[PDB]
Structures are given as structure tokens and as C-alpha cells.
Design a protein around this nucleic acid. Sequence first.
DNA 1: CTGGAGAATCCCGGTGCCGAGGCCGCTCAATTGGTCGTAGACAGCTCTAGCACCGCTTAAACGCACGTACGCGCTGTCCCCCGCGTTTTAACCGCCAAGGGGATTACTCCCTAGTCTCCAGGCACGTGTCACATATATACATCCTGT
Lengths: 80, 81, 187, 94, 96, 95, 105, 108
Amino acid sequence: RDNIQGITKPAIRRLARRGGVKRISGLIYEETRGVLKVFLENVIRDAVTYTEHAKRKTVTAMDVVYALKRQGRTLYGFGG
Amino acid sequence: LRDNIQGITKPAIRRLARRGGVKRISGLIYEETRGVLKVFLENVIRDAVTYTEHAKRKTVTAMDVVYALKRQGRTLYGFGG
Amino acid sequence: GVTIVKPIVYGNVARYFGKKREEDGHTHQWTVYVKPYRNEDMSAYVKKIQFKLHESYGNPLRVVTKPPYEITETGWGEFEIIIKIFFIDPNERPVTLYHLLKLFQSDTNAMLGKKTVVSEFYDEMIFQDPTAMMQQLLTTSRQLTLGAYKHETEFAELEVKTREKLEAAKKKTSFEIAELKERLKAS
Amino acid sequence: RSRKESYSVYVYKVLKQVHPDTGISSKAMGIMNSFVNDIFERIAGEASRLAHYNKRSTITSREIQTAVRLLLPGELAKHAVSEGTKAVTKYTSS
Amino acid sequence: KRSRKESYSVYVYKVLKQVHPDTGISSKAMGIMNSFVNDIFERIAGEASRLAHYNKRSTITSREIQTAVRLLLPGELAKHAVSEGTKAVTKYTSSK
Amino acid sequence: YRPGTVALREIRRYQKSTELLIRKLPFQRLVREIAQDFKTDLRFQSSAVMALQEACEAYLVGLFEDTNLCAIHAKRVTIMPKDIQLARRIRGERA
Amino acid sequence: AKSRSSRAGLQFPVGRVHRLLRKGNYAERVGAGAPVYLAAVLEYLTAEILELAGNAARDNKKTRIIPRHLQLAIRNDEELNKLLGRVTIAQGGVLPNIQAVLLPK
Amino acid sequence: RAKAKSRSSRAGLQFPVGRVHRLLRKGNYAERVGAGAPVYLAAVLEYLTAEILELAGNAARDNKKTRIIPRHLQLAIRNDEELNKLLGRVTIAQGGVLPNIQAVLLPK
DNA sequence: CTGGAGAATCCCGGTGCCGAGGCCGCTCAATTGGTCGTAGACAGCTCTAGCACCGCTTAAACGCACGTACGCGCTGTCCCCCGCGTTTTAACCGCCAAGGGGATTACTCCCTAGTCTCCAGGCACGTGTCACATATATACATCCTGT
């Protein structure tokens, strides 16, 4: 499938603008896609382990919140 | 007691920096290291004493320091008993 | 109508090296200090103490941030040190003191062979109509240590007062012990 | 009814004291709901471990106070401890 | 009037002596070997605890223990731990 | 000795030993003076002070390993105070 | 007749905060005033955060605390930023700040 | 009665299942522990103990020492890719560090 | 520094949509009232450490002196990201009408687990010591750095 290119250069530039970045190197978009795909795969992998254990077929938002709290990255606003 | 942050000498800092890969050290970095170390020590010591005052004890045992380090994300092995 | 009196002692000790140092020519070590007269914690109301030295030193304006406030240094001549004590409350005017750094003994004290030179003076910081915060800080001062607290100058007189007890007890103990041991061995 | 309980009735009762005319959006109210579940579990877990440290088998108010001391930055801890101790003092007299 | 304190030293030397017959272990290294065991025990039990509570359950189980080992140990570390435990539970319920 | 030859030797030597690098007696008074501000007359188990030292030397060695990477960032060999500050800020200690 | 929470001069639930304590396998004995203390602390943190966020939003010409201003109130406070250091408030964005080096002139 | 068999033995473990389950029974980690949790937990605990004791002893032998010191633990848990991860936020007392000298700080 | 254009911001006032709060009505759950073991607290008391001192030894910290090596600074060179206009892909509807995959929930029931006994090996703390390796010693090997 290979749809890691949905996170496009304009999107990475918007995320950099929000983060204060005011100039971005050319090879910063092929870096950020590898950095984001490792972070996603880690939080999804833990959300699918909290979903298999509950004998459920749909990854609910609670699974994502629990798996995100496992990494330390704590997000407020989705029932946890 | 008084003026004990000076008990961390210039060689004492230089050796620690050598173990960390640092080759050449600057002049002001010794004072920066003293400040950073002082802050870290004060936090750990405060949290350890939190386990002693609550325990009505007068001596800070090793388990108190181990737990204070754990709360700081600094799990230490060797003092667990 | 609130007046708070805080007794303090500020001075200097000095030790003679016995010979002039070849590295810098200094002849005496000295420690200049402010400490409380009572066994109380000055840090509850003192933010810092600044000591301004003679312009011969690489930096004349020294700073100390915890009681008993003191600086240890070396020198060969006497000079006036300006001690500026700042309080925690910025609205309170800091106190200014002038201490004549004494390093040499008088003829009478030199003849007595005394190992240390001391010059210290007693003073009272008076806070008249202090702010609420400053008043609370001055009234909430805790004890500094569980041990004793004492004064040194006239150093020769204090040393003689100490020895008037020390040598008496030492001689008593020595003679009594010698007598006991000799009598017991003779039997 | 029951199903899903939450903090919403206390995040809005306490908000009407600080700012009588300020409201709160459903999303922001949800965020406050979530935030309280964070601190509750943090303080209670550190208090359970504290009970485990002095080998008690009970979480008393002393354990909770020491757990509050371990997490709040100074002024925050110094005022939270006062809040808790005043509440416990006033609840023991009634 | 004794004050005896427990530790894992007796079973870390069984396992070490078995997985290194000629190699000893210093007392200070066994302290680390003890703290490591207690730390991982805490981690796996806590994650199983949370696992059970998330599914509205009053009991921490070996199924929750396996899922906590899947969450805790990295990929290989996990695989080996899960396999070892899984095979230890079928050797125990077969009345050997 | 060519500046940097006796210093690299020490890097290779202090990265192979495991003994503490701060003197004991000087560091134990610092741990008691810091305790001062929380409780008058606090006692310390000897092993407790040793554990404090084992915490701090490891923390400082990690901070001097993360500070060196920042020095190498600006094409420097010297670690500068802003390097400790950048490492620590990226650490979230003084953000 | 009188909720245990009311008998502290509080707005928060001393009663349910007791049940959450002695149901979550924290210990084996929740004291009389363990929930009375924890509820007080929770209500205190709520008061602080709610006030800050509320009139941060009213600083924005708003009469409804929005999560953007929840984030602003939390991120501007030095104590609440230490407490909620590793917490990401959703739909709260970031704080406005431009590094001097980037800025022109 | 019957000769009593332990729980470490029936399963085939070295770490105390009785003691492990015991810390759990009066550890409030849960409310009603089952009959497999301590077995799994002890099995994996001791598995990691073995996993590390291995690398520690091997590095020790690299140093021509027969006794594992904490150094043989720092060196190991930092030498293995996944033990380091698992014990990334763990300092080993009297272990030291690994001699990672930056390439740019070398003689040129 | 002023000019003068040309774009961006930036509050004022306006206009509907829809979330935020208003109330109502029962379900869950916190209160009330009371008996029943007991958590831990507090009053001793054993006995380790902790602390505090003092001496002798010497590593080590430290100050100084002297080049060398490395650090902010300048400038020039060249390219690679910014700004912005055009071509291309993604991505919404309307058009098309509902099955079904799966969380949500209970009611039985049998199996697992607490509770609570009485035994019996096995884990701790001694004791009895044996011996890795720390410290010491020397030549061998790099491993420099000044010529």
C-alpha cells in the first residue's frame, strides 16, 4: 500500500510553522516521514495489543489513550 | 553547613566529563555543572526526606533515596537489599 | 510602632604564616565574617551579604549567600572592608558596615606569643516600622545549630580564660594520674 | 440512570465560584474531566506505594498528604496541603 | 529479635550456576541481580493490574500477564519471555 | 604533551574504570548542607549517601555525554555553557 | 441527609472519591479522611486551572472557557506546566513565541 | 499426606512462584489473583535475569575476570540492543559507562 | 530617514447555527445506623549505627607559567530553499439503498478462587572459612613529539 506519503511536504511545513520553524531543509520531509512512521507504529502496536486483549475487533479511542500513556506521551481529551 | 557546593573541584568535574566523551572543557562549564548538580541533588534529597518525615524517622535510609530516584525516572540498582 | 532589634557580630580573624610567601608576598591568612550574636538563622531574613575589599584583588566585590557569612582570603596589609547586608524584602534598606581588617598584633599581644589575631565588633540591626513580610521573617527566625555559639576577640583574653580552666584541669589530671600509677606499681 | 459517570457536575460547580459568568465548552469540560482522572490516579498510586513503604495496609490522609507533597511544585503543594488539611479538619468536627 | 530480610539471591545463583557452571557472581553484582528482578516484577505486575482494570476486572490473570509481557518487553525480549512462560503454564497444568 | 593527547588518554581511562570520580568527604558535606533546608538534625545511612553519589555521577556523566553532542553540533571540541543549557532545555529541566 | 462532601465546605464529591479509592486496589483500608483529603486536593487543582483557563478565554473576549485557553492557562503557569509536563491537551495548539534569531531587523 | 511439591518445581522455574504470587496476594496489584499470574511473572522475571547474567558473564570473561562486577552489568545492558531499551532509564551502581569516544574528538 | 504603494491585520457591527446550559424524571449510589474484629499507635527496651572525635600519610587539589590549539569573526562564493504562479490530483457530493459486523447486556450456571485450617520442607541468618584479584614489580610495546 505504502501511503506514508500522505503526510506531504506542505503538511510537514505546516507542522514546522506551528513549531516555530522558519526555514526547512530539503531532506527534512524524508526524515520526518521516517520519524513519524516509527512513532505511529509504536502507538498503534500498543493500541492493537490493548484491543486483542479485550477480545474486541475495533481499536477504540480508549485503546489509543492507554497505549499513548504507556509511552509517556499523555493526551487529554478523548475520555482519558 | 556552609559553602559545600565548592566541594566539587575542577578536577572532580573534569574527570566526570572525561568519562562522558568530552575532550576539551571550557572555563565557565565548571560553574554550570555545579548549578545543574546542585539542582538535581536538592530535588532528590527533598523527595527522599519526604519519605523520612512521613515515616517519623530521623535518619534518611537507602530505600528513601532509591524511591526518590525512582520518582525522578532514575531507577538505581545496587541498593535494593 | 514596631521596632525589631537583631544582634550581630562582624569581624575578622587572621593567622600569620610565619614567613613571607614567595608566590605572592602575602604574610597572613584572614577570614572576614558577619555572624549572629544569638544562635539564630540569619538566612531567614538576609538575602545576601556583599563584602567590598581593597582594589589590589582581582575582584574586590565578593558575595556570600548563607550564614554564618564569611570569606577566607590572604593578604599582607590592613584595609577597610565595606560589608553590605541585603535583606529578603527589597523594600528594606540594606545595612552598611565598615570593618578595619586587623592583621598585626600589638606589642603586648606579640610578646604573649598568641597564635591568632582577631578584631570583631558587636552591633544591632534596628528595623523600625518594617513591612509585614519582613516582620514575619524576623519573628520566625529559627535556631541555627544545636551546639553552642560564642565570641573570640579580645582573643588573648579569651585564650587566657580558656587556659585558666584547661591547664588547671590538665595539671590536676596529670599529677593525680602520676601519683596513682606510681603508688599502685610500688605495691 | 448511570452508564457513564464523570466529573462534569463538579468541574462546573467549582467553575461557577472562580468565574460566575464564565461557561465551559463540551470539549473543554471533557478535558477537565480527563485531567481530574489523571491526578486522582497519580496521587492514589503514589499513596498506595507510600502505604507500602511504611508497610501499612491502609491509605490514610497522612499517606495522601505525603503523596501530594511529592507531586506539586512548592507553592502548588503548599496550597494543596492546606486545602486538604482544612477539609479534613472541618470534616472531623461535623 | 532477628530482623530477617528476603531477597532473590538463592534462585539467581541456581539459574546462574546452571547457565554458567564455571562463573561465580559477586555479592555486589547479586544486589543488582536482585533489584533487577524486583523491578521487572513490579513492571509486569503493574501492567497486568492496569490491563485487568481497563476491562473492568477484579483479578490479574496470566492472560493479562502475557499481554503485559507483550507490552513491556521489546520485540525479541517479548517473544522469548512469552514463549518461556506459555510453555511453563502447559508443563504445570499437565500435572508434571 | 600536545594539547589533547593527555586529555584523550584520560577519556579512554575514565571510560574503563568504575570507581567514583567525586571525592567522598567533600561530597557528603554537600548532601548534608542540602538536607539542612528540610529538617534540622537529619541523619543519613552511609549507604544512602553512597546511593546519592551513584545517582549524581551517573546523571552528570549522561549530561556530559549529551552536552558533547551539542558541542560537536557547532563544529566545536570545547563544551560551552550554552551546550549544557541546550542539552538540559531539550531535556525539559529548565524549558 | 448530608453528603459527606458538603461536610467540608466543598463543591467536590467526597463520597464517590472514596469509592474510587477503595475499589481500585490501591490499599486495603481507605481511612475516614483519605477521600476527604483527596477530594479537597482535586477540587483545589480544578479551581486553579479553571480560573486560569476561564479568564484567559475571557482575555480573548470570550465568555466560555475553550480548550485553547485551557492550554494557555496551563502552559503559562510555572507550577501547572511542571505538573502537566507530559500531557498534551487536545485541540489546544501551542504557545505564541518567535525565536529572536528568526525575527527580522 | 502427599509429599508436598512446590510451584517453582511443577512448572519448572528457579524464581520463587510462591514468593512471587505472595508479593502479589498482599500487594494490592489486583483484587483476586488467579492461578497463572505468578507463574508467568516469575518465569519472565528469571528469563530476563538469565538473559542479562549471560551478557554480563560474557563481558566479564572478556575482562579476564571470574566474578561479575557491576561493570559487567553496565557494559552488558548497554552492549545488547534490547536490554538497553528495557533498562534504558536504569543506572547500575558501580557499573561505569562504555568507552564511546566521539570520532570528531580524535587525533587528526 | 522620509516617501509612496501594496498587502496584511484588526476591531466594529451584523447575522444565523447549535452547542451549553436549563429543567424533569427516575436509577445508583452515597448516607444512616449498628456489631465486629481488629490497624496501628503508643509505651517500653534491646543494641546498631550514626556521629564525633583524633593522628599519620600522601594523594590530590591548586596556583603558576607557557605555548598551542582551538573559538568568535569576516568575507566571499555558490547553491538551495522561499515566494509565487500555473497544472494536477484528491476529494468532497448525489445518486444509490440498507444489511451485517460487532459492541452492549443478561441470564443462568459450573468452575475457580478466597478463607482458613493444620503440617513440613526451604530460606534466612548465622558460622567456618578459601580464595579472586587488588596492589606491587618489571620488561615489552606502543605511542608520541622535537629534530
